[PDB]
């Protein structure tokens, strides 16, 4: 199927509690594979998946150096953002970055990203064209002009079309037995009366990977979107995910309802019912 | 602008009384990132609870998984207690094996 | 592999 690689940075100032903390986490799809934390005794990029462990010492040195330099750069970025927003030195602030690439089944680039946020709001983002920027406001326009003069977008485009795609191809192969294995959801429908004349039908999906799934209820074949209670997809802690969808139905009419499940791990989409 | 956490409390596998499992508390959709999460057994804090590496979603909001190994029973009550800058007091969500 | 290029805000 299709895959993503993403790096996520968080830089968080903490006046009175030391210098700003810098963290990087790297993912392939929903699998964490590397982490860096400036608060560690020996700050370094650490492997978090067995398929990256096989990377040699030259990989860890290069990756650690990028993150050590980023710790210093992002502390500067936090001071610049404070100045651009006329803020005092007393409060805690956060810069986030998410960058990386999506590829299709043929390994080719679908799209790239390089997005930044300040205090949970958009700051600046590379457009999908990989050649221009969207600055959220007049503060971020200053960074935009600096990055336009330094031809940052051209450098991002080269990385996103090149090393991003190539390292995702390498990682997907080295980790093919996990990264390229879609685990289908294990499903069941529960029944709970809510009154003498209505019941809850809850359709469960457990043990699936990746997180992407569609769970819907139908009445005679019609979608019940506005009357379905959904929970956000949640991690089980063993790499897999969980989700449920529930509908309130008249007692004695349970057989009119079908739960529909779509997931990459299934040979065919499922159509389920409550089994009394 | 700040976002209050969503909270879900649940088990790794469907609960079976007497069988070893994991008790999870998933906190998500919150901003800023500082958060306090406790797992409770009959109202008391469970010691040595572990958590995932802080991460964030497409909309910039943060998420974490707190977890511990446990053996459910018919009588033992489990819950999660969460505190965050958006909450005036800690929020307790009880574990329901059907949720 | 991360991008090694860096320039501040």
Numbering used by the authors:
A (entry chain A): 1 to 276
B (entry chain B): 1 to 99
C (entry chain C): 1 to 9
From the study:
Our previous work identified NP338 as an immunodominant CD8+ T cell epitope in individuals expressing HLA-B3739. Our conservation analysis of the NP338 viral peptides across vaccine and circulating IAV strains, including pH1N1, H5N1, and H7N9, found 16 natural variants of NP338 peptide, with the most common mutations occurring at position (P) 5, 6, and 7 of the peptide. To understand the molecular basis of cross-reactive TCRαβ recognition, we solved the structure of NP338 and its variants bound to the HLA-B37 molecule, as well as the structure of a cross-reactive TCR in complex with HLA-B37-NP338. Thus our data demonstrate that CD8+ T cell cross-reactivity in the context of NP338 peptide and its variants is favored by similar conformations adopted by the epitopes.
We first refolded the NP338 peptide with HLA-B37, HLA-B18, and HLA-B44 molecules and assessed the stability of each peptide–HLA (pHLA) complex. We used HLA-B*44:05 molecule as the refold yield was higher for this allomorph than for the HLA-B*44:02/03. The NP338 peptide could bind each of the three HLA molecules (HLA-B37, -B18, and -B*44:05); however, the stability of HLA-B37-NP338 was superior by 6 °C to HLA-B18-NP338 and by 14 °C to HLA-B*44:05-NP338. We then solved the binary structures of the NP338 peptide presented by HLA-B37, HLA-B18, and HLA-B44. Comparison of the HLA-B37-NP338 with HLA-B18-NP338 and HLA-B44-NP338 complexes show an overall similar HLA-binding cleft, with a root mean square deviation (r.m.s.d.) of 0.2 and 0.4 Å, respectively. Similar to the HLA-B37-NP338 structure, the NP338 peptide was anchored to HLA-B18 and HLA-B44 by P2-Glu and P9-Phe. However, the NP338 peptide adopted a strikingly distinct conformation when bound to HLA-B37 as compared with HLA-B18 (r.m.s.d. of the peptide 1.7 Å) and HLA-B44 (r.m.s.d. of 1.8 Å for the peptide). In HLA-B44, P5-Arg was fully exposed to the solvent. Owing to the presence of four tyrosine residues (9, 74, 99, 116) in the cleft of HLA-B44 located underneath P5-Arg, Arg cannot be accommodated inside the cleft and adopt a different conformation from the one observed in HLA-B37, that only shares Tyr74. The structures also demonstrated that only HLA-B37, and not HLA-B18 nor HLA-B44, binds the NP338 with a secondary anchor residue (P5-Arg), revealing the hydrophobic surface of the NP338 peptide, which might help cross-reactivity. This hydrophobic surface of the NP338 was disrupted when the peptide was presented by HLA-B44 or HLA-B18 molecules, which exposed the charged P5-Arg, and for which no T cell recognition was observed.
